[PDB]
């Protein structure tokens, strides 16, 4: 046993991190418990940011963000307890049934933008948003995974789980491909825009069998919207997928956008020590 949590099967076991299924004995909620090497994260250059973002994600409750229930530590380990959802991955709808209708795409896009924008407002940037982070609960609501956790060092992100993405480079903004540092908000917004493209088209905007030509297209944002895209959706997508992060549209501008505001009901919800986030207890 571990905490108020009863353990189930091992989901993955990487070298410095591992993930177990569990349930909360007090309420029966499904969770996953990630156990990671403590010194690997303590030694890391960006530890103060890690501590800050993780401490923040503990506090955040947004209806469209995966909950981080607990964060505890041993002398050698850090434990994370994360909400486990049962509706699968959002992109499964495309694998099984092709592109989504515009209204269903816009709905998920609204949940996504609001959740991402909310985390940004609390100083937390994903920086590696991929379709595999777009999960669905029993009722079909979007739950975005890995905010905060994505800030951990690579060797601890290798946690024994299968992580592949169809069309990986598509979701990474040109400035993230090419540069060491970058703006987190603009990098996340690029990812969201590609996600929206795929939901509405059923296929990736950037492709080429030739890798040099593929990355050339990404850096110029050379892509083509299919004919079923509306004029207003195409125009918003082209502003989001601006290959220059200096001129790329802002989240605030996306939220004010006429296409975006269609059927848009901002969700009503409420959300009302850092250095000691990983010490023993």
- Considering only the stretches 68-76, 111-119, 169-177, 240-248, report the one whose residues sit in contact with its own copies under the rule CB under 8 A: 169-177
Task: Tell me if 110 contacts ligand CPS by CB under 6 A.
Answer: no
Residues 146-165 that bind its own copies (CB under 8 A): 150, 153-155, 157-158, 160-165
The answer to whether the CB of 87 falls within 8 A of the CB of 81 is no
In the window 196-225, what residues touch its own copies (CB under 8 A)?
198, 201-204, 207-214, 224
CA–CA distance, 255 with 215 (Å, rounded to integer): 29
How big is the chain, counted in residues?
281
**DSSP, res 14:** -
Question: Does the annotation list 143 as a binding residue?
Answer: no
Smallest gap, in angstroms, from Cβ of residue 273 to its own copies? Answer: 28
Query: Distance (Å, rounded) from C-alpha 185 to C-alpha 129?
Result: 11
Tell me the C-alpha distance between 107 and 94, whole Å. 15
Q: What angle do CA 201, 91, 186 make, to 5 degrees?
A: 75
Q: Which of 5, 16, 17, 19 binds ligand CPS (CB under 6 A)?
A: 19
Site string for ligand CPS, 120-159 (x = CB under 6 A): ---------------x---------xx--x----------
- Residue 194 has what DSSP assignment? H
Stretch that binds ligand CPS, among 81-89, 112-120, 196-204, 242-250 (CB under 6 A): 81-89
Q: CB under 8 Å to 77, separation ≥6 — which residues?
A: 35, 36, 37, 38
Residues that bind ligand CPS (CB under 6 A): 11, 19, 32, 34, 66, 82, 84-86, 88-89, 95-96, 135, 145-146, 149, 161, 163, 177-178, 180, 210-212, 215
């Amino acid at each position: 046993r571990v905490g108020k949590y009863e353990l189930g099967r091992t989901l993955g076991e990487g070298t410095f991190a591992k993930v177990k299924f569990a349930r909360n004995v007090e309420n029966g909620d499904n969770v996953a418990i990630k156990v990671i090497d403590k010194e690997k994260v303590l030694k890391n250059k960006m530890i103060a940011q890690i501590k800050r973002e993780i401490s923040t994600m503990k506090l955040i409750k947004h209806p469209n963000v995966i909950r981080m229930f607990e964060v505890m530590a041993s002398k050698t380990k850090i434990y994370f307890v994360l909400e486990f959802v049962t509706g699968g991955e959002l992109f499964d709808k495309i694998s099984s049934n092709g592109r989504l209708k515009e209204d269903e795409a816009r709905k998920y896009f609204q949940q996504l933008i609001n959740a991402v924008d909310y985390c940004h407002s609390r100083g937390v940037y994903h920086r590696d948003l991929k379709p595999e982070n777009l999960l669905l609960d029993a009722n079909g609501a979007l739950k975005v995974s890995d905010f905060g956790l994505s800030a951990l060092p690579q060797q601890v992100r290798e946690d024994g789980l299968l992580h592949d993405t169809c069309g990986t480079p598509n979701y990474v903004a040109p400035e993230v491909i090419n540069n060491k540092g970058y703006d987190g908000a603009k990098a996340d917004l690029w990812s969201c825009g590609v996600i929206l493209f795929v939901l509405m088209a059923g296929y990736l905007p950037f492709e080429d069998s030739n890798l040099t030509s593929l990355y050339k297209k990404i850096f110029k944002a050379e892509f083509t919207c299919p004919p079923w895209f509306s004029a207003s959706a195409k125009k918003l997508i082209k502003r989001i997928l601006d290959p220059n992060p200096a001129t790329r549209i802002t989240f605030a501008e996306v939220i004010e956008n006429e296409w975006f505001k269609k059927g848009y009901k901002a969700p009503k919800f409420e959300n009302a020590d850092v250095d000691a986030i990983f010490d023993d207890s």
